[PDB]
Scaffold this active site. Structure first.
Site, PDB file in Angstrom:
ATOM      1  N   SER A 161       0.910  -1.167   0.111  1.00 56.15           N
ATOM      2  CA  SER A 161      -0.117   0.198   0.004  1.00 56.15           C
ATOM      3  C   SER A 161       0.858   1.283   0.020  1.00 56.15           C
ATOM      4  CB  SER A 161      -0.905  -0.089   1.163  1.00 56.15           C
ATOM      5  OG  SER A 161      -1.954  -1.042   1.233  1.00 56.15           O
ATOM      6  N   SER A 182       0.062   3.989   1.894  1.00 52.75           N
ATOM      7  CA  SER A 182       0.013   4.762   3.123  1.00 52.75           C
ATOM      8  C   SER A 182       1.193   5.372   3.648  1.00 52.75           C
ATOM      9  CB  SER A 182      -1.022   4.040   4.306  1.00 52.75           C
ATOM     10  OG  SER A 182      -0.012   3.062   4.938  1.00 52.75           O
ATOM     11  N   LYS A 201       2.384   2.117  10.264  1.00 53.72           N
ATOM     12  CA  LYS A 201       1.966   3.548  10.328  1.00 53.72           C
ATOM     13  C   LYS A 201       3.077   4.286  11.229  1.00 53.72           C
ATOM     14  CE  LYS A 201      -2.007   3.117   8.086  1.00 53.72           C
ATOM     15  NZ  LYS A 201      -1.941   2.033   7.088  1.00 53.72           N
ATOM     16  N   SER A 205      -4.252   7.547   3.764  1.00 54.24           N
ATOM     17  CA  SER A 205      -3.920   6.569   4.850  1.00 54.24           C
ATOM     18  C   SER A 205      -5.079   6.248   5.843  1.00 54.24           C
ATOM     19  CB  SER A 205      -2.830   6.959   5.641  1.00 54.24           C
ATOM     20  OG  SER A 205      -2.533   6.337   6.675  1.00 54.24           O
TER      21      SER A 205
HETATM   22  C1  LIG Z   1      -2.948   1.450   5.973  1.00 55.86           C
HETATM   23  N1  LIG Z   1      -3.910   1.332   5.799  1.00 55.86           N
HETATM   24  C2  LIG Z   1      -1.303   0.915   5.540  1.00 55.86           C
HETATM   25  N2  LIG Z   1      -1.743  -0.612   5.199  1.00 55.86           N
HETATM   26  C3  LIG Z   1      -1.125  -1.455   5.630  1.00 55.86           C
HETATM   27  O1  LIG Z   1      -0.214  -1.219   6.748  1.00 55.86           O
HETATM   28  C4  LIG Z   1      -1.226  -2.986   5.353  1.00 55.86           C
HETATM   29  C5  LIG Z   1      -2.820  -3.358   5.607  1.00 55.86           C
HETATM   30  C6  LIG Z   1      -3.208  -4.424   4.882  1.00 55.86           C
HETATM   31  C7  LIG Z   1      -4.416  -5.151   4.771  1.00 55.86           C
HETATM   32  C8  LIG Z   1      -4.590  -6.243   3.918  1.00 55.86           C
HETATM   33  C9  LIG Z   1      -3.645  -6.911   3.419  1.00 55.86           C
HETATM   34  O2  LIG Z   1      -3.853  -8.168   2.690  1.00 55.86           O
HETATM   35  C10 LIG Z   1      -5.199  -8.772   2.687  1.00 55.86           C
HETATM   36  C11 LIG Z   1      -4.948 -10.011   1.819  1.00 55.86           C
HETATM   37  N3  LIG Z   1      -5.528 -11.009   2.522  1.00 55.86           N
HETATM   38  C12 LIG Z   1      -2.370  -6.552   3.442  1.00 55.86           C
HETATM   39  C13 LIG Z   1      -2.167  -5.439   4.215  1.00 55.86           C
HETATM   40  C14 LIG Z   1      -1.233  -7.234   3.024  1.00 55.86           C
HETATM   41  C15 LIG Z   1       0.115  -7.425   3.884  1.00 55.86           C
HETATM   42  C16 LIG Z   1       0.863  -7.829   3.388  1.00 55.86           C
HETATM   43  C17 LIG Z   1       1.287  -8.498   2.179  1.00 55.86           C
HETATM   44  C18 LIG Z   1       0.041  -8.336   1.290  1.00 55.86           C
HETATM   45  C19 LIG Z   1      -1.215  -7.741   1.753  1.00 55.86           C
HETATM   46  O3  LIG Z   1      -2.144  -7.682   0.951  1.00 55.86           O
HETATM   47  C20 LIG Z   1      -1.973  -8.184  -0.400  1.00 55.86           C
HETATM   48  C21 LIG Z   1      -3.474  -7.743  -1.051  1.00 55.86           C
HETATM   49  N4  LIG Z   1      -3.535  -6.368  -1.713  1.00 55.86           N
HETATM   50  C22 LIG Z   1       2.327  -7.816   4.514  1.00 55.86           C
HETATM   51  N5  LIG Z   1       2.569  -9.275   4.797  1.00 55.86           N
HETATM   52  C23 LIG Z   1       1.264 -10.187   5.099  1.00 55.86           C
HETATM   53  C24 LIG Z   1       3.798  -9.767   5.251  1.00 55.86           C
HETATM   54  O4  LIG Z   1       4.720  -8.646   5.275  1.00 55.86           O
HETATM   55  C25 LIG Z   1       4.164 -10.812   5.670  1.00 55.86           C
HETATM   56  C26 LIG Z   1       3.946 -11.368   7.141  1.00 55.86           C
HETATM   57  C27 LIG Z   1       3.443 -12.522   7.837  1.00 55.86           C
HETATM   58  N6  LIG Z   1       2.846 -12.357   9.018  1.00 55.86           N
HETATM   59  N7  LIG Z   1       5.506 -11.226   5.323  1.00 55.86           N
HETATM   60  C28 LIG Z   1       5.678 -12.401   4.558  1.00 55.86           C
HETATM   61  O5  LIG Z   1       4.811 -12.781   3.744  1.00 55.86           O
HETATM   62  C29 LIG Z   1       7.139 -12.784   4.132  1.00 55.86           C
HETATM   63  C30 LIG Z   1       7.507 -13.962   4.317  1.00 55.86           C
HETATM   64  N8  LIG Z   1       8.742 -14.540   4.166  1.00 55.86           N
HETATM   65  C31 LIG Z   1       9.719 -13.620   3.664  1.00 55.86           C
HETATM   66  C32 LIG Z   1      10.978 -14.034   3.415  1.00 55.86           C
HETATM   67  C33 LIG Z   1      11.998 -12.930   2.894  1.00 55.86           C
HETATM   68  C34 LIG Z   1      13.103 -13.315   2.690  1.00 55.86           C
HETATM   69  C35 LIG Z   1      13.543 -14.644   2.956  1.00 55.86           C
HETATM   70  C36 LIG Z   1      15.187 -14.956   2.542  1.00 55.86           C
HETATM   71  C37 LIG Z   1      15.717 -15.423   3.909  1.00 55.86           C
HETATM   72  C38 LIG Z   1      15.822 -13.963   1.732  1.00 55.86           C
HETATM   73  C39 LIG Z   1      15.182 -16.399   1.875  1.00 55.86           C
HETATM   74  C40 LIG Z   1      12.675 -15.762   3.367  1.00 55.86           C
HETATM   75  C41 LIG Z   1      11.476 -15.114   3.675  1.00 55.86           C
HETATM   76  N9  LIG Z   1       9.240 -12.122   3.349  1.00 55.86           N
HETATM   77  C42 LIG Z   1       8.064 -11.841   3.571  1.00 55.86           C
HETATM   78  C43 LIG Z   1       7.690 -10.345   3.323  1.00 55.86           C
HETATM   79  C44 LIG Z   1       2.050  -7.300   5.660  1.00 55.86           C
HETATM   80  O6  LIG Z   1       1.184  -7.729   6.597  1.00 55.86           O
HETATM   81  N10 LIG Z   1       2.346  -5.761   5.605  1.00 55.86           N
HETATM   82  C45 LIG Z   1       1.738  -4.777   6.693  1.00 55.86           C
HETATM   83  C46 LIG Z   1       2.859  -4.015   7.220  1.00 55.86           C
HETATM   84  C47 LIG Z   1       0.811  -3.951   5.482  1.00 55.86           C
HETATM   85  O7  LIG Z   1       1.435  -3.485   4.539  1.00 55.86           O
HETATM   86  N11 LIG Z   1      -0.441  -3.906   5.948  1.00 55.86           N
END
Ligand SMILES: *C(=N)CNC(=O)[C@@H]1Cc2ccc(OCCN)c(c2)-c2cc(ccc2OCCN)[C@H](N(C)C(=O)[C@H](CCN)NC(=O)c2cnc(-c3ccc(C(C)(C)C)cc3)nc2C)C(=O)N[C@@H](C)C(=O)N1
Length: 239
Positions: A12, A14, A69, A202
């Site tokens: 996103s 935001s 945030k 945001s």
């Molecule tokens: C305000 N309004 C700002 N918005 C946010 O703050 C968002 C809000 C939000 C809402 C919904 C939503 O998804 C809904 C889909 N069901 C998301 C965010 C969201 C969040 C994320 C990804 C996608 C996404 O939506 C997609 C749909 N448009 C991330 N997220 C889930 C992660 O970052 C996860 C966390 C797990 N708990 N991490 C990973 O998936 C991850 C796993 N493994 C690795 C990784 C990297 C490197 C390596 C090596 C060692 C190099 C091999 C191994 C493994 N990396 C990652 C990133 C999310 O939750 N983000 C939040 C902050 C967000 O953006 N929320």
């Protein structure tokens, strides 16, 4: 001191221009463990966010989701936001609700155009975003508005914010804290007022309220990768 680090994807806008769609950040978790001299017990301390830190937390309206945030309000803070100037006023330790004069200095730089343009999809007579385009300052984009940029100093932390020149907040869609007036909040103990750097793009505490201390996951420390092509210029510290 055994600190746990976790990677997050930024899908996103935001947190623009600080964090962009395609950034991959590192988060330092607030809870860390410390074992006994050799082996007897293990103490788990939980760090607290500092005013201005970029914090990841479990969304209060749906704790299954993580949100990111900037922690602009800490416990005891009287947070006031002017939707017209798009500026904040922080008065710490004013939890009682008295005429306090120990206000935190929140200063703003001169407003200038950013490297970002925002386009809107015409939904049969409407405006809803499709994405944020990185466009050269001398150039332009169709159905797109050039966003403004200025620096914000939260006492001792300077960072950048983005603003849409046409859009203004609908204070009737704001979360209104009981007893307080609109656009004015007093952060209760163990709570945090969170705001996004893309101030007009945001969904933050202005709309869904404070974040409890138990909901905090950690502090964003670095951008370890970024895709759009690789944005190798963005790998490093978060400023
Ligand atoms: C305000 N309004 C700002 N918005 C946010 O703050 C968002 C809000 C939000 C809402 C919904 C939503 O998804 C809904 C889909 N069901 C998301 C965010 C969201 C969040 C994320 C990804 C996608 C996404 O939506 C997609 C749909 N448009 C991330 N997220 C889930 C992660 O970052 C996860 C966390 C797990 N708990 N991490 C990973 O998936 C991850 C796993 N493994 C690795 C990784 C990297 C490197 C390596 C090596 C060692 C190099 C091999 C191994 C493994 N990396 C990652 C990133 C999310 O939750 N983000 C939040 C902050 C967000 O953006 N929320």
């Amino acid at each position: 001191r055994s600190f746990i680090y976790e990677p997050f994807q930024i899908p996103s806008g935001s947190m623009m221009p600080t964090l962009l769609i395609g950034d991959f950040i590192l988060v330092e978790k607030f809870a860390y463990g410390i074992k006994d001299p050799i082996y007897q017990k293990t103490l788990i301390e939980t760090g607290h966010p500092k005013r201005g830190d970029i914090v990841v937390f479990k969304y209060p309206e749906d704790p299954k989701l993580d949100y990111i945030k900037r922690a602009v309000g800490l416990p005891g803070d009287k947070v006031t936001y002017d939707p017209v100037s798009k500026e904040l006023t922080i008065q710490p330790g004013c939890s009682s609700g008295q005429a306090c004069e120990n206000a935190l200095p929140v200063t703003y730089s001169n407003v200038e155009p950013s490297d970002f343009v925002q386009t809107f999809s015409r939904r049969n007579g409407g405006e809803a975003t499709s994405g944020f385009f990185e466009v050269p300052k001398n150039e332009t984009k169709e159905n797109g508005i050039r966003l403004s940029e200025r620096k914000e100093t939260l006492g001792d932390v300077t960072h950048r914010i983005l603003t849409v020149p046409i859009a203004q907040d609908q204070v009737g869609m704001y979360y209104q804290q009981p007893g307080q007036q609109l656009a004015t909040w007093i952060v209760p103990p163990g709570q945090y007022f969170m705001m996004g750097d893309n101030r007009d793009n945001s969904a933050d505490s202005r709309y869904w309220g404070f974040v409890p201390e138990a909901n905090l996951v950690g502090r964003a420390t670095a951008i370890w990768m970024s895709f759009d092509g690789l944005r190798l210029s963005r790998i490093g510290g978060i400023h």
